[PDB]
Write a protein that binds this DNA or RNA. Structure first.
Lengths: 138, 138
RNA sequence: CGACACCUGAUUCC
DNA sequence: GGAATCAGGTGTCG
């Protein structure tokens, strides 16, 4: 079972923005981390970009092997519900990210499950987002 | 001329609710302020109650002296239009509130007029609504 | 279908 | 103390 942790932030909303990804196995071993600066964006876009990247990163694990679940956890109710089909996606740019993600699910990741989590459970990803932002602004 | 500002809110609709009243002269003098927690009610009931309270306060300006105009300014199309004869009043509880008001007009305040206004221009009355609710919940 | 109002959840921050 | 980015719905009218 793969668990992914995703985070994003944008300073000034919109503003200088970053993404963080943590990938672990069931036991909580960290398989991979990613951190990146993504220019100036909205908060919501940053969350989506983090997810996309994480999904992207999932390839590093071969692109032959699969069928083992993935659970994505993020501190964002909006994107998680939207992914769950619970909440609509209306904003156009967000609609674009959703399409990208949908495509990826279809192509390479059929087993994707999403869970909202509170801020506390996701410090490492948030650490990663900030590491990227600070460095870029420096 | 008397200018009255009226506001209500209910948190959760229905939920904890409050009323705000500001009374002024033509010269922007603030004659009186009223504020109260009213329990849990609908958003619309809260608006009417503020109006009722405002009309009540109007006596503190003596119960002998009149035929000087009154304008009620409030941020509710529903209530303003209903008062104006533009909208029917259907819901049972609202009807009663309307009736209470028509009466006070009948007894005491014949020169009564109603104006709908935007959210931005009603800040003080709205401050009072929230002040009263916050205090009650505290 | 629309007006106005009441909010409510989550996030991003300043 | 504040605002912006994005969703959910109710209370009452037309």
């Amino acid at each position: 079972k793969i668990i992914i942790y995703t985070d994003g932030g944008a300073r000034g909303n919109p503003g200088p923005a970053g993404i963080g990804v943590v990938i672990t196995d069931e036991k909580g071993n960290t398989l991979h981390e990613s951190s990146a600066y993504i220019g100036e964006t909205t908060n919501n876009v940053a969350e989506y970009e983090a997810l996309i990247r994480a999904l992207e990163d999932l390839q590093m694990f071969g692109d032959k092997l699969v069928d083992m679940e993935v659970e994505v956890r993020m501190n964002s109710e909006l994107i998680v519900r939207q992914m769950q089909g619970v909440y609509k996606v209306k904003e156009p740019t967000l609609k674009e990210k959703f399409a990208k993600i949908a495509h990826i699910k279809m192509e390479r990741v059929p087993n994707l499950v999403f869970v909202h989590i509170p801020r506390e459970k996701n410090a490492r990803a948030d650490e990663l987002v900030n590491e990227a932002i600070d460095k870029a602004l420096s």
